Design a binder for this molecule. Structure first.
Ligand SMILES: CCCCCCCCCCCCCCCCCC(=O)OC[C@H](COP(=O)([O-])OCC(O)COP(=O)([O-])OC[C@@H](COC(=O)CCCCCCCCCCCCCCCCC)OC(=O)CCCCCCCCCCCCCCCCC)OC(=O)CCCCCCCCCCCCCCCCC
Ligand SMILES: CCCCCCCCCCCCCCCCCC(=O)OC[C@H](COP(=O)([O-])OCC(O)COP(=O)([O-])OC[C@@H](COC(=O)CCCCCCCCCCCCCCCCC)OC(=O)CCCCCCCCCCCCCCCCC)OC(=O)CCCCCCCCCCCCCCCCC
Ligand SMILES: C[C@@H]1CC[C@@]2(OC1)O[C@H]1C[C@H]3[C@@H]4CC=C5C[C@@H](OCCC(CO[C@H]6O[C@H](CO)[C@@H](O[C@H]7O[C@H](CO)[C@@H](O)[C@H](O)[C@H]7O)[C@H](O)[C@H]6O)CO[C@H]6O[C@H](CO)[C@@H](O[C@H]7O[C@H](CO)[C@@H](O)[C@H](O)[C@H]7O)[C@H](O)[C@H]6O)CC[C@]5(C)[C@H]4CC[C@]3(C)[C@H]1[C@@H]2C
Ligand SMILES: CCCCCCCCCCCCCCCCCC(=O)O[C@@H](COC(=O)CCCCCCCCCCCCCCC)COP(=O)(O)OCC[N+](C)(C)C
Ligand SMILES: CCCCCCCCCCCCCCCCCC(=O)O[C@@H](COC(=O)CCCCCCCCCCCCCCC)COP(=O)(O)OCC[N+](C)(C)C
Ligand SMILES: CCCCCCCCCCCCCCCCCCCC(=O)O[C@H](COC(=O)CCCCCCCCCCCCCC)COP(=O)(O)OCCN
Ligand SMILES: CCCCCCCCCCCCCCCCCCCC(=O)O[C@H](COC(=O)CCCCCCCCCCCCCC)COP(=O)(O)OCCN
Ligand SMILES: CCCCCCCCCCCCCCCCCCCC(=O)O[C@H](COC(=O)CCCCCCCCCCCCCC)COP(=O)(O)OCCN
Ligand SMILES: CCCCCCCCCCCCCCCCCCCC(=O)O[C@H](COC(=O)CCCCCCCCCCCCCC)COP(=O)(O)OCCN
Ligand SMILES: CCCCCCCCCCCCCCCCCC(=O)OC[C@H](COP(=O)(O)O)OC(=O)CCCCCCCCCCCCCCCCC
Lengths: 488, 100, 29, 35, 56, 174, 75, 101, 55
């Protein structure tokens, strides 16, 4: 009996460690004897340790995660794809946590519950990746969402943070209701919620004239929920406001991990299921809309956070092009784009968090940065050029596959749109470089140097961004492996 | 005709939630209430289908969805409370400062 | 003559155990 | 792939459900009368 | 002014260390979390200057 | 006919939820909607869910809403607006949803037209399933804690998040 | 020649220096950290090369199974 | 409760015991398992101590870190030992001990 | 609202639901004609596909 639970050792450990940290934090934060010490950094270090131990347990027990698969079948499904997805999610959570300590001590954000909520949301996203039934998927999505709602409003006396939370909760709850409605329609039409059963029922028919309008609209509503989650246009406008109004570590965490988890879900639901061309057209139209609107709106922005939010919207458009074309290379390119976008976003938010110690808000606040911190201005410039997709930086991979998918599938309008939006993006990315290197403002802002954690993370992500295309084989192989494991 | 009548009941509840979103641009508390109405309609959809299909999966998920609805309302009303506390008012013109 | 901070001494032992155990872990793998 | 749902990973229910076929809650009602 | 300068320049090693730690602890604040805890952190008197040297 | 009565009550009560000028009144009508829903559940034979909808939706959730809305003391000027100018946008959106979504089951689940003949005699009775009948309660409890226990525990995690968030966002200890 | 150990050691040393520079510290502020970084970089690079080999090995079998499943169509 | 330990990916090494008992797995702990266990616990205690200094709770922080490390290290050692007995990990020692007793 | 207003709204809603019942009966009664139209269009499409494949 005990050995059956080897399939959930990683999750058991992280949940138990989260409980231990909750108890530790609440017991000593309330201690008069110890004079109510702030425990955000102490619990943060212990939680980083817990995340790393979870990663060790998961990575080193690759075969064991598939033990007792028949017993666990109606609860979740662990395979090669979920293996690598969960590893990448844990690595992202560890990096995001490591970027938070200067924020904890200098702002004096003393709430250790922040770390606990991050860990519980990580548990939720882990269960999201392995979900193999509509019920499990919904429950894990809701756990993740509720944790985000709470942490988005963590600055509870701030107008901005409270506004972010309110908008997030209302729009999140609305989208979740729409998705749940879709799930109910699919169950009513097919008598099934398990992904295997849905695959068997729906395969071979798609729209064979006598199409289940119940099945067709259930798929549509579920897709609407998914598109809200990935911040695809027109279900996107929550994202810029929430990203700007939340505390910056929250914004960094939301920018990466939920995308990993929800794309895992989207792959395993749609790609593994079957209504077909309709849904790929959904993601097609939403990709084009996201690219255009992200480019234009980002061009309008004068503030750093809003610029990065709109940039992420545009990039999810680029990524969803891969899901749309419905090929093994499409899935592989989508995974490559997520990995690279995640490492670039981690780099960018490490810089943003470093600069938030002097309250960076506007793009113009970067003036004369090439004088006051030359190596920081260069590092940030490499990130921008990578965001623009200039070769041979890592960001060039997404542009290359965008045009690779258009030319082959025959999509000349998509290629047109990609060219235009890439040029617009390059303009608003090099505007930052111009501000740091070319401008001569009358008043300068002198920034405090970053802590060791962010400097090390920045140093590694900056080598990756510059040097990835010298040795890209492991990512290429691992992502081809994952794309294949979805069906075999 | 039973199944079409049970489904249209839940359907009118869902459409009422949608209308409540549409008609309450100055009243975000009612917007939250409309979202609960939609969640209730979905829950009813699972229960009706469970009976019609003679299957228990609709019933397990209905209970779990009730748990989600409870947690959602708790957290949402907390966020409403803190927004009101910061502003002293619930009017929508005082929660529009993030834009662009 | 003696280090009196008991918790510090325990932490020192823990660090030493980590280092030596890591060396042994590498050596026997 | 051709017939992916044929692949053993996808036939989990065909092998699990027989193991619980005698569990109260999913038995044919006549099984209790004869057992 | 001479009083505060004389007081600072005559402090021993131990008091210098104590005040370094105290200064670091009270350099920033989270009054919202204190209100959640229901406590009020007060500046220690060894960090407060006399009123006769303050600008007012 | 009985489903016509309950659906009419639900329709009117829901319109009152979304259209009452006073939010306290909205919460009270919401409570009427849950009562009608419980009636439908009793018609379906799901007495456990019928009672739980009273216990949780009315007994706990609506009470929370009422406590919060009552202490807010909302003035109507802060949330008033004329809705006559929304009739068209609600008309298209409602109609499209009406035409699509009230009739989605019609092609898959075609109704049996009631004829001028007693079909009740064609009801076949199997007494084997009637020797030991299970309540809704015990049928659900046979499954929640053993075969689907992981989802049960994840729901517990969701409730824990609710508790933590409620404390962290609103607590001001005296 | 240019071995994974040497590339990794150079990358680790560069990482420590880049980290120091980002913090506006002298390049060689804590030299024992430079030694630690060279060691970790060498270890990382060697493990990445071995992992790459293993990854290609697994992808080979998996592509083989995909090809067999596809070829079953023409039977 | 019906159970089935059968894994999706078969074991690539001889199966000494398909579903080893808890105490059998613990008694199967090797020197390398104990090294992993002790290293994880020691690192965790060290992190607890160092991160606890600033709040002033280095002792209790050491205890908390040590509890986390003890649980994680035991889970990791159990994972390795059970995987060896089940044939999922290289298990030369288990096979040698099995072919003799 | 007035109590009588609520009662009258309930009566109007009852009339609406009975009308919906009539609509459902209408939709059910036209299943056969819809099937016939679907079959004729399927035959036309299949004939066109077979004829165009001849070239
Ligand atoms: C033969 C027997 C004779 C003996 C028995 C006779 C019994 C008496 C008759 C029964 C009662 C009828 C009279 C009602 C009271 C009138 C007296 C009075 O003083 O009213 C004051 C009243 C003032 O309002 P108030 O109550 O003081 O509240 C003030 C504030 O609003 C309060 O603030 P608040 O916050 O509480 O509320 C906010 C807001 C609340 O906002 C609202 O309530 C929305 C108002 C618009 C309602 C829209 C329709 C809702 C009903 C649902 C219908 C189906 C909808 C389907 C939609 C989904 C489909 C996609 O307030 C309002 O907007 C008030 C508007 C009220 C207007 C109601 C109009 C109802 C629509 C009637 C349509 C008729 C069409 C007939 C066919 C229908 C199709 C089948 O003014 C009126 O006179 C209006 C009421 C009169 C019309 C309503 C009753 C209609 C009944 C028709 C008869 C049934 C026909 C079908 C028979 C079927 C047989 C098979
Ligand atoms: C075989 C069956 C036989 C049945 C026989 C009985 C048939 C009765 C037919 C009556 C219709 C003809 C009426 C002719 C005129 C009568 C003369 C007259 O109106 O003077 C009365 C006069 C007020 O008349 P008014 O001039 O029209 O003034 C109206 C407003 O002032 C105007 O001010 P406003 O404009 O500001 O409005 C504010 C709002 C006030 O704000 C509100 O929110 C109103 C309250 C609604 C929600 C309150 C309940 C939820 C709160 C929680 C309560 C505890 C929950 C748990 C316990 C109960 C659950 C079982 O006022 C209203 O909206 C009132 C609308 C009433 C809707 C609620 C009643 C319908 C409930 C469903 C009945 C189902 C059966 C009848 C239908 C059958 C099929 C057709 O004074 C009274 O009504 C006496 C007060 C005692 C009332 C007790 C009623 C029961 C209360 C306890 C139970 C609560 C739950 C309700 C039942 C739940 C069932 C599960
Ligand atoms: C604690 C707090 C306090 C508040 C509270 O809780 C909280 O307090 C709680 C207290 C709750 C009430 C409690 C109780 C009820 C009664 C229920 O109402 C029963 C209705 C059902 C039962 O009705 C019949 O059931 C049997 C017949 O079915 C009768 O058996 C005969 O027939 C047998 C067979 O020959 C013989 O063998 C037997 O010997 C012979 O006797 C039996 O006598 C009779 O009862 C359902 O019936 C219908 O359903 C039919 C199907 O849809 C419909 O058929 C139609 O459609 C068909 C096509 O579809 C066409 O083919 C048909 O031709 C065409 O007619 C039709 O409309 C109608 O029949 C309505 C709900 C309500 C009010 C609750 C409301 C909510 C509360 C107030 C709660 C509240 C919230
Ligand atoms: C060809 C690529 C495609 C095009 C993209 C080009 C992107 C760059 C744009 C080119 C235009 C000119 C760019 C000028 C940058 C050169 C100046 C520079 O970066 O110097 C930095 C140097 O920045 C660095 O630190 C770079 C380190 C990267 C390490 C990469 C080497 C890896 C292996 C080397 C091993 C160690 C050294 C071996 C020999 C000792 C000095 O930084 P400061 O902020 O001035 O001061 C730093 C503080 N302190 C000196 C006190 C330490
Ligand atoms: C004569 C030939 C022998 C020469 C030996 C040279 C070997 C030296 C190798 C360098 C080791 C570097 C280890 C870096 C970790 C630094 C450990 C440390 O700082 O000790 C601290 C903390 O120690 C620990 O918490 C755990 C690490 C100690 C374990 C490693 C000790 C290295 C020497 C071994 C001494 C123990 C050997 C005997 C044990 C019975 C003492 O406690 P606190 O003063 O309270 O710490 C304040 C915070 N701060 C870290 C910033 C100083
Ligand atoms: C983030 C930054 C990237 C990190 C830098 C590169 C990492 C290199 C470290 C690995 C070196 C040694 C690995 C040891 C090894 O082969 O053991 C395996 C551990 O794998 C591992 O350690 C797997 C590491 C996987 C890295 C993350 C992959 C992300 C994929 C991108 C997709 C993102 C989109 C998600 C929607 C388990 O042994 P095994 O080989 O038997 O186990 C899989 C069988 N099937
Ligand atoms: C200037 C001249 C061009 C103006 C736009 C031309 C519009 C027609 C293009 C067209 O036919 O669109 C099809 C659908 O593409 C689409 O994706 C549809 C058009 C784009 C919709 C999404 C963007 C909307 C605008 C977003 C920003 C504004 C927001 C609202 C203010 C392309 O056919 P195909 O590419 O599928 O062919 C695949 C073949 N293998
Ligand atoms: C692939 C491209 C090429 C890459 C190059 C690879 C080379 C390997 C890297 C070599 C590293 C060189 C330097 C090594 C010596 C430094 C040792 C760190 C000292 C240390 O204990 O740091 C502590 C802080 O932790 C820290 O600062 C450590 C945390 C740093 C963050 C990184 C790890 C986070 C988790 C994983 C993130 C993964 C993200 C990817 C998605 C205390 O520092 P202090 O004593 O100065 O006091 C700071 C004030 N509190
Ligand atoms: C073999 C070469 C490489 C070996 C490196 C040491 C052995 C590996 C153990 C892990 C080392 C990781 C890096 C340790 C330093 C991490 C960053 C600590 C910096 C920090 O903020 O805290 C300092 C603690 O010092 C410290 O943490 C350092 C404490 C003493 C370590 C220095 C001795 C290293 C020995 C190198 C070879 C010795 C040859 C003889 C055996 C306090 O800083 P502070 O106030 O003390 O002063 C600093 C003047 N800016
Ligand atoms: C895992 C399954 C259940 C999960 C949920 C429940 C988990 C259990 C609750 C955990 C909550 C944290 C407990 C913290 C206890 C601290 C005790 C204390 O005050 O210590 C101070 C107390 C006295 O020291 P002082 O703080 O210097 O007075 O103890 C120590 O500091 C002892 C330090 C030496 C310990 C080193 C070895 C640790 C190995 C792991 C055990």
């Amino acid at each position: 009996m005990f050995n059956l639970f080897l399939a959930v050792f990683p999750e058991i450990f992280i949940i138990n460690a989260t409980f231990i940290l909750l108890i530790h934090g609440v017991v000593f934060s309330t201690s008069k004897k110890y004079d109510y010490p702030p425990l955000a950094s102490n619990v943060g270090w212990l939680g980083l340790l817990s995340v790393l131990i979870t990663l060790l347990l998961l990575a080193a027990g690759a075969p064991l995660l598939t033990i007792a698969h028949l017993f666990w079948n109606n609860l979740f499904r662990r395979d090669n794809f979920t293996y690598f997805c969960q590893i990448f999610l844990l690595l992202s959570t560890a990096g995001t946590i490591s970027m938070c300590f200067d924020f904890f001590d200098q702002e004096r954000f003393d709430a250790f519950e922040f770390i606990v909520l991050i860990l519980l949301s990580t548990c939720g996203m882990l269960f999201m990746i392995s979900a193999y039934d509509l019920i499990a998927m919904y429950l894990a999505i809701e756990l993740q969402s509720l944790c985000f709602y709470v942490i988005a409003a963590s600055k509870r006396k701030s107008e901005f943070s409270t506004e972010a939370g309110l908008k997030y909760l209302i729009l999140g709850a609305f989208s979740s209701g729409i998705l749940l409605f879709g799930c109910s329609m699919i169950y009513g039409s097919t008598g099934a919620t398990h992904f295997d059963q849905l695959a068997k029922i729906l395969t071979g028919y798609e729209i064979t004239g006598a199409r289940s309008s119940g099945i067709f609209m259930g798929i549509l509503f579920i897709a609407v929920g998914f598109l809200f989650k990935i911040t695809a246009v027109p279900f996107h406008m929550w994202a810029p406001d929430i990203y700007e109004g939340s505390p910056t570590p929250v914004t960094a965490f939301l920018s990466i991990a939920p995308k990993i988890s929800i794309f895992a879900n989207i792959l395993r639901v749609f790609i593994y299921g079957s209504y077909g061309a309709t849904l790929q057209q959904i993601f097609f139209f939403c990709s084009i809309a996201s690219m255009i609107l992200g480019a234009l709106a980002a061009m309008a922005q004068t503030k750093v956070k809003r610029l990065l939010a709109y940039s992420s919207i545009g990039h999810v458009g680029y990524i969803c092009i891969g899901f749309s074309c419905g090929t093994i290379e499409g899935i592989q390119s989508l995974l490559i784009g997520i990995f690279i976008y995640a490492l670039m976003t981690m780099d960018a938010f490490a810089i943003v968090l470093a600069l938030r110690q002097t309250r960076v808000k506007y793009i113009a606040d970067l003036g004369a940065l090439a004088k006051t911190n030359p190596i920081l201005a260069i590092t940030f410039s490499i990130t921008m050029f990578s965001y623009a997709g200039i070769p041979p930086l890592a960001g060039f991979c997404s542009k290359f596959y965008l045009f690779f998918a258009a030319l082959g599938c025959g999509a000349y309008f998509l290629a047109l749109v990609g060219v235009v939006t890439s040029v617009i993006g390059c303009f608003y990315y090099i505007r930052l470089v111009k501000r740091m290197f070319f401008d001569t403002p009358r008043t300068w802002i002198l920034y405090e140097p970053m802590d060791r954690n962010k400097s090390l993370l920045l140093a590694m992500t900056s080598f990756f961004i510059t040097l990835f295309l010298l040795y890209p084989s492991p990512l290429f192989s691992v992502t081809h492996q994952m794309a294949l494991s979805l069906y075999l | 005709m039973d199944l079409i009548k049970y489904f249209t009941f839940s359907m009118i509840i869902f459409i009422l939630g949608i209308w409540g979103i549409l008609l309450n641009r100055r009243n975000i508390l009612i917007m939250l209430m409309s979202i609960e109405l939609m969640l209730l309609a979905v829950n009813l959809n699972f229960l009706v289908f469970s009976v019609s299909l003679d299957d228990m999966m609709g019933q397990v998920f209905a209970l779990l969805v009730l748990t989600v609805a409870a947690a959602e309302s708790a957290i949402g009303l907390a966020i409403f409370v803190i927004t009101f506390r910061v502003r002293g008012t619930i009017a929508v013109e005082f929660i529009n400062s993030i834009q662009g | 003559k003696v280090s009196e901070d008991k918790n510090r001494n325990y932490a020192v032992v823990a660090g030493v155990v980590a280092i030596v155990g890591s060396i042994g872990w590498y050596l026997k793998a | 792939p051709y017939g992916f749902w044929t692949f053993e990973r996808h036939n989990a229910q065909l092998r699990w459900d027989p193991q619980i076929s005698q569990v109260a809650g999913r038995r044919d009602p006549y099984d209790d009368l004869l057992e | 002014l001479a009083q505060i300068h004389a007081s600072e320049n005559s402090k021993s090693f131990e008091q210098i260390e104590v005040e370094r730690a105290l200064r670091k602890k009270y350099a920033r604040k989270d009054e919202d979390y204190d209100s959640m805890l229901g406590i009020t952190r007060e500046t220690p008197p060894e960090l407060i200057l006399p009123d006769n040297v303050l600008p007012g | 006919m009985i489903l016509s009565v309950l659906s009419s009550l639900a329709l009117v009560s829901g319109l009152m939820v979304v259209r009452a000028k006073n939010p306290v009144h909205s919460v009270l009508f919401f409570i009427l909607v849950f009562c009608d829903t419980s009636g439908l559940l009793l018609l379906l034979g799901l007495d456990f869910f019928a009672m739980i909808f009273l216990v949780v939706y009315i007994g706990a959730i609506a009470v929370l809403f009422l406590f919060v809305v009552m202490m807010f003391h909302i003035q109507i000027a802060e949330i008033h607006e004329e809705v006559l100018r929304y009739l068209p946008v609600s008309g298209i959106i409602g109609l499209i949803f009406w035409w699509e979504m009230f009739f989605i089951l019609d092609n898959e689940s075609i109704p049996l037209l009631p004829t001028q003949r007693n079909t009740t005699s064609l009801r076949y009775t199997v007494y084997a399933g009637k020797v030991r009948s299970w309540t809704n309660l015990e049928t659900l409890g046979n499954l929640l804690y053993t075969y689907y226990f992981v989802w049960f525990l994840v729901s517990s995690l969701i409730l824990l998040v609710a508790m933590i968030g409620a404390i962290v966002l609103t607590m001001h200890r005296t | 020649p240019i071995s994974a150990t040497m590339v990794g050691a150079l990358l680790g040393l560069g990482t420590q220096m880049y980290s120091n520079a980002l913090r506006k510290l002298p390049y060689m502020r804590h030299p024992w950290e430079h030694v630690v970084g060279m060691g970790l970089g060498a270890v990382f690079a060697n493990q990445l090369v071995k992992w790459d080999v293993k990854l290609k090995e697994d992808l080979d079998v998996m592509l083989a199974k995909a090809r067999a499943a596809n070829e079953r169509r023409y039977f | 409760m019906n159970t089935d330990i059968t894994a999706l990916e078969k074991a690539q090494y001889p199966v000494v015991d398909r579903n080893p008992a808890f105490t059998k797995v613990v008694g199967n702990f090797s020197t390398l398992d104990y090294l992993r266990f002790s290293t994880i616990t020691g690192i965790s205690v060290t992190v607890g101590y160092l991160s606890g200094i600033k709040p002033g709770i280095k002792g209790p922080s050491m205890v908390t870190g040590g509890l986390i490390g003890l649980m994680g290290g035991f889970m990791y050692a159990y994972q390795n030992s059970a995987g060896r007995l089940m044939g999922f990990f290289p298990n030369d020692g288990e096979v040698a001990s099995y072919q003799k007793r | 609202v007035k109590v009588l207003t609520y009662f009258g709204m309930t009566l109007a809603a009852f009339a609406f639901w009975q009308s919906m019942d009539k609509v459902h009966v209408w939709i059910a009664l036209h299943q056969d004609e819809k099937q016939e139209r679907m079959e004729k269009e399927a035959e036309v499409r299949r004939v066109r596909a077979e004829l165009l494949r001849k070239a």
